[PDB]
Design a protein around this ligand. Sequence first.
Ligand SMILES: Nc1ncnc2c1ncn2[C@@H]1O[C@H](COP(=O)(O)OP(=O)(O)OP(O)(O)=S)[C@@H](O)[C@H]1O
Ligand SMILES: Nc1ncnc2c1ncn2[C@@H]1O[C@H](COP(=O)(O)OP(=O)(O)OP(O)(O)=S)[C@@H](O)[C@H]1O
Ligand SMILES: Nc1ncnc2c1ncn2[C@@H]1O[C@H](COP(=O)(O)OP(=O)(O)OP(O)(O)=S)[C@@H](O)[C@H]1O
Ligand SMILES: [K+]
Ligand SMILES: [K+]
Ligand SMILES: [K+]
Ligand SMILES: [Mg+2]
Ligand SMILES: [Mg+2]
Ligand SMILES: [Mg+2]
Lengths: 525, 525, 525
Amino acid sequence: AAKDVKFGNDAGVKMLRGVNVLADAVKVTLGPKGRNVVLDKSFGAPTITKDGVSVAREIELEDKFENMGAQMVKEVASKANDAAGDGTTTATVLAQAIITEGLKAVAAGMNPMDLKRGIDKAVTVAVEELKALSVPCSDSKAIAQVGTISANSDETVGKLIAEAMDKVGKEGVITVEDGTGLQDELDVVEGMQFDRGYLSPYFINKPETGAVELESPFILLADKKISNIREMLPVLEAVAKAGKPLLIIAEDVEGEALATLVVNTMRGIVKVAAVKAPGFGDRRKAMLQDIATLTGGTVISEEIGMELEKATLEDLGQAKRVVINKDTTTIIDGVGEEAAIQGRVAQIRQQIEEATSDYDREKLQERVAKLAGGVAVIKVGAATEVEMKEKKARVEDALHATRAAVEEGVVAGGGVALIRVASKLADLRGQNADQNVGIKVALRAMEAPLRQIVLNCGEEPSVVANTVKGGDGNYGYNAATEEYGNMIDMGILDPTKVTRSALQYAASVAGLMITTECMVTDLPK
Amino acid sequence: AAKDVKFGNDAGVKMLRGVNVLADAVKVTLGPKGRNVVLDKSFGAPTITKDGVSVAREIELEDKFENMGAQMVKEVASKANDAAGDGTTTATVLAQAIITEGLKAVAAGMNPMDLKRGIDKAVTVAVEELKALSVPCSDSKAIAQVGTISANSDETVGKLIAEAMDKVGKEGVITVEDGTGLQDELDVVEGMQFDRGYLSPYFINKPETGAVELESPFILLADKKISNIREMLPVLEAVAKAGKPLLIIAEDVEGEALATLVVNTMRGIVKVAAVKAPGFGDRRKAMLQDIATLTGGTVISEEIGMELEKATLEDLGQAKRVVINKDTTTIIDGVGEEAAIQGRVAQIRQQIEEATSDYDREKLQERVAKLAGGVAVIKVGAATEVEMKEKKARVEDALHATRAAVEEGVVAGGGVALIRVASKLADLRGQNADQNVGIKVALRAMEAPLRQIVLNCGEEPSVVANTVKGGDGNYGYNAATEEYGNMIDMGILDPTKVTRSALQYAASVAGLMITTECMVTDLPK
Amino acid sequence: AAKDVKFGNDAGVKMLRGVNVLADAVKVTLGPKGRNVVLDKSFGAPTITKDGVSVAREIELEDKFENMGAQMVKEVASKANDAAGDGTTTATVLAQAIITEGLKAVAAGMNPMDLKRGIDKAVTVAVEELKALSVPCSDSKAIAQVGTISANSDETVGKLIAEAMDKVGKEGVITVEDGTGLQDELDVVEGMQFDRGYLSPYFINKPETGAVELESPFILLADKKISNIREMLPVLEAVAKAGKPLLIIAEDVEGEALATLVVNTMRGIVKVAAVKAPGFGDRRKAMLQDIATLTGGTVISEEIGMELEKATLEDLGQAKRVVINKDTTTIIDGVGEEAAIQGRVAQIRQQIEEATSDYDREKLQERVAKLAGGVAVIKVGAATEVEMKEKKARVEDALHATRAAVEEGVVAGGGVALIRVASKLADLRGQNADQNVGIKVALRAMEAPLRQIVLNCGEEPSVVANTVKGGDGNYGYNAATEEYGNMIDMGILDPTKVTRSALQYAASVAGLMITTECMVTDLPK
Ligand SMILES: Nc1ncnc2c1ncn2[C@@H]1O[C@H](COP(=O)(O)OP(=O)(O)OP(O)(O)=S)[C@@H](O)[C@H]1O
Ligand SMILES: Nc1ncnc2c1ncn2[C@@H]1O[C@H](COP(=O)(O)OP(=O)(O)OP(O)(O)=S)[C@@H](O)[C@H]1O
Ligand SMILES: Nc1ncnc2c1ncn2[C@@H]1O[C@H](COP(=O)(O)OP(=O)(O)OP(O)(O)=S)[C@@H](O)[C@H]1O
Ligand SMILES: [K+]
Ligand SMILES: [K+]
Ligand SMILES: [K+]
Ligand SMILES: [Mg+2]
Ligand SMILES: [Mg+2]
Ligand SMILES: [Mg+2]
């Protein structure tokens, strides 16, 4: 279709405008004094929220070029979301600040490539220095503290997460499920988790977590690619009965078959989700088997001349619950018998003995750990379905934050970590003056989060920014009480990982937009 | 429908505007400091690319005449791409440069035909001069160097390519496949490659390479054209079982049959790809047999009263893997037994003895080389599926570039080769003044690539151009470091083949546009 | 009337647009290869000029804000013109260069006050550096050389000027008049020149020189202010007869009387011009008397109870010719008798003896020097009225240039002086980054003159600028022959005074525009 094509500054003003509409809508919701954003709905009362992600997903602009700018930033923020699980508003505010001054520098005649290089050098040095501000979170006491703080001061949620990590290790798998009613429950079941997400959205039955969740489903373990639905027809119907959902763990589910699954499960016609088998090559088959041994299923490989048509509900594996993200599948409590499972473990355990290569050794140890590690499960307390569903949400978030904190620690919140780091980089220089402008653009943007938080309070950004910059260490501004103090002692913490991610993703998009010379989009016809 | 018709100048300004929009969008991506171009998508985030071809594909204009000019010059990139697989952006800026000055000369009253003749003469001599400057890439050391340079300084990839060419010769067939995991693998198998691509896209299952790849497929060797699907029905079903893809190597697959194959394999209903048989006439049949002997199949020719209906999976040939490009089919590791194959070789070997004509002699030697040469297979190292898939890409590109280098050598990159050539042609003249202007148009356009590379750096084109022209030999401008020096010593080389192709296709399309007097298109209604 | 009021950016873009129209129209006329500009006339053929001042005078824009910007920068040329009588085009291109980059920096957010401070510092140091590079023009050989060069290599005009200055001193008064025919004439007459211009234009009968010229006029020396025309009526009529013009040298001619004089002399009704009396206070009267003694007139002061009504043509002084500029009156050849004049000299000469103060002593020596110095008169050769009128023009210009050269020396022309100065200031810095940007804005603007000269040649500005900057000293580009060489040896020189003035006035007006925040003008109604 005929295209509209814009160059240089023409494209620049358009991108900046789109970015500003997105960032301005989103940023009003940052921090304890975040304001409400009303999102219209075709049916019912409008949604009223302080959650930046919800606001962002609704942002689409009429002007084609402006919409492109908006969509570009949305992407990165969501990426920060995927990587750290928090800080999308922070990232969006950092991105607007870098893009705004960067595009201005470009209109001023500065070399885009150099501006980008300066920005990148500042970020690289900045994340390194952010580590110096970090407070580790290794012992259970620390884990408990972070969890409590992340759970709105609920020392209960804190103890739960700490105990859970104490069971399966802070690097282990942990899940949360509705409780049986009153009093929490923590138990380790036979489970496993591999790096493979849904073969397409839609399967996502819980957009709240943007994941797919199945209860007591059957697990088809096909050691091959599935293109023709015909092969599935027999098994899909066998599963149609028994009224249980089906999880497809094949080498891959291609267009034809996948398309059908997406349409059928879209019409309530049998609930089925598909994900690729873990690993590739040889180890793939070996791993697909570990899953079988765990779920009590039977691998259907063509190597042994087996057909999916000739597959009954007896071949299928089974587990009490399975959850799959954008890129992760977790099987909770499989039917497999400890006899077969523990035996399988013994086998692989000898494999490691006969290992003649570190690589093969590592890969084997990975399997035993997965098959012998299990899955810690947290069943949230209760006393009414409403409160139970609520506390469950808190435990979910607290857990998420604590996990990030365990990986890279926590730093002062309220935007002080980033501003503290920027205030110590004023002497940083690059190869030339344009690169030096880039560095300054970056150091300046690092103050935007704190500034927006204060602005949302109804206070003066520059005055508070100044005062914070004047102190040192964790000295900062508490936006909830409007008093200065030690951010760590006041319990205003951000996982180091989310702060670093927000900055790197913001810088990354900004760098791309700053070095964009031409935009192509459909004509507004 | 009713047409809009434009003549001379009216048509010229339209064409020029159309080529300018396309060329301007494309040329910003040229070189190490190429800028980003954002391409809108109907869903999700826009595409951000520094790839010229990707930009060109999206260019379509509203004004019917301007669109014609854009689509015409777009042919330059596509042909240069098909012929050399690189240098499409370079070819596009050369075309714009030639078209711009050429149309100006026409508007000035100069004879279009003479202008074109002059341009052609300059290009003819320029190509000869380009060959003269070309540095060979014959020994394994040179091959290793080029490979390393093309692999982003990865001396590993360099060694691999060098060893692969040492096995099957620099003219031999070489492929790259995913590795078994960690450490590369190089092995020669029974294989062959002939000049015939897919009989239509869609068969392309891997758009990343725009090629078709089949694993352990059956190979139908039919010595005749296939129009009716009926004939295939019996064999297609036999192949439906055993769950293996099918490669059709017939004299040709016409509409009816082809259309069906495209639709069926489009629905996952049996994976089948079709390509014409190598050569034509008599040699065609002899060659179709060489493939049979290699894949252990049986030629199904009507000459012996054979029917496709009466063809079983036993007649079909087979190989571990086959890959087909837009114009190349490569069969890797065929089932044929060394007894039959090596025997077939002996036969053709005598054919050469009894050869009473050089032509027949050449053609025969070509067959023995293909059948006795084999196929070197490069299995890329690993250590995680992600890195493995990445390194595979690099090896593929490095191989492609090194192959080109071996054919015609290499010349200084950064646009300096064309500048040196242009300076050597300063005294070139034609039959008249208009032809002389055409020659000058071409020599001037030869500086465009270096000038655009510099412009993208944010430096001054005329100053750098002036300085490079000031020195000589491999003296050029390194746009990555913004330092002058010896292009070869700095490792900035271009295969002579891509430079030559870019120039010839640019001059070719430019010549046509310059000699265009009238344009016809549908009325904007 | 109602006003239109604009602020910041809105006002800025308007001013920039206005200076760009003016500067672009003017700068095309710069240097040896300056282009022609056609200026429409209400009647007859249009004016075709390469004179920057002629072009600037015609520039007026429709948009009220754009017009203001144009008229403001137009002040640059006029002031530089009044100060050095040359380099108005150079001054305009320097102003546009400073304004353009300065307004960009303002739009980029830099502090306007600091940008101006940085620009001002750079110009201050640049002027000092300019004086350091200046070569003196003190001896008659140098004076002859400069004159020759300024007269288009006419060694004749060079000798004439050298001799004239040798007569009355290089600081003495010199005039040029039509010759009697063939062969030049140099003689000194009883004359004097004081710092007082016409009390209003209109009196200007020769717009070519923008000055007023009277031949054999009567000189009224009234020692008081004249407000009522009544007083003049009697004398004006006495002068109405004898058919001679009248020069009014009173303490001042105020509104009423002045207005009448402007109207009457506007209708050919008696030619009269008025100028204030030299000096002020006491010395004023004494000086007004020196003029009387020189012109043979009689001071009409009220102190002795004298009335202008009772003044006859006998009281009026007289001289063969008088010329008055915007701020200078020169009486050439007065009627006064050498007896009275030389006697008056003796008087003042004793005054100097009895002087008890240096100040009084200096002031007295100034008077004797004026009254005893006379006025050198150069009568241009001939051989046909046409050639005579021409040579006269050259002598006038060569004289003007040589005068400037004597005052401050000469520097390489072709814009190389400013380029050499700029390079010597590469390390100049201010109090902060914004001031440093200002400094760079100024150093960059200094290359504008040379670049525009090259541009008008049809050559590449950056290439030539680069080459010139590459060399040093008087190495420069000769735009007439398009060859590099020693500007001095090639005779391409500019009086340090015009280069200095162009730079200071440009920076002065640029600094004012850069620090303007609001513009007020009438509503376009
Ligand atoms: N009392 C407080 N004073 C100052 N800042 C606080 C306080 N409590 C929390 N914060 C900060 O507020 C920020 C988090 O606010 P949110 O509104 O959740 O936005 P976000 O995490 O950047 O993006 P979302 O949540 O993905 S939308 C972090 O910088 C917190 O440290
Ligand atoms: N450091 C360098 N300095 C100068 N030129 C370089 C450098 N590195 C690569 N080049 C040149 O850049 C050109 C290739 O740039 P590309 O952006 O890949 O465009 P292209 O190959 O013309 O078209 P594509 O790649 O098909 S879009 C060749 O002239 C290279 O020699
Ligand atoms: N052969 C030459 N090569 C280079 N520059 C020259 C040459 N001859 C004169 N110039 C320069 O041209 C400039 C003077 O050009 P003009 O066009 O007269 O403009 P201007 O004096 O700046 O303004 P006007 O004359 O008042 S409009 C000075 O910088 C001279 O040194
Ligand atoms: K919020
Ligand atoms: K590129
Ligand atoms: K001029
Ligand atoms: Mg948050
Ligand atoms: Mg390329
Ligand atoms: Mg001049």
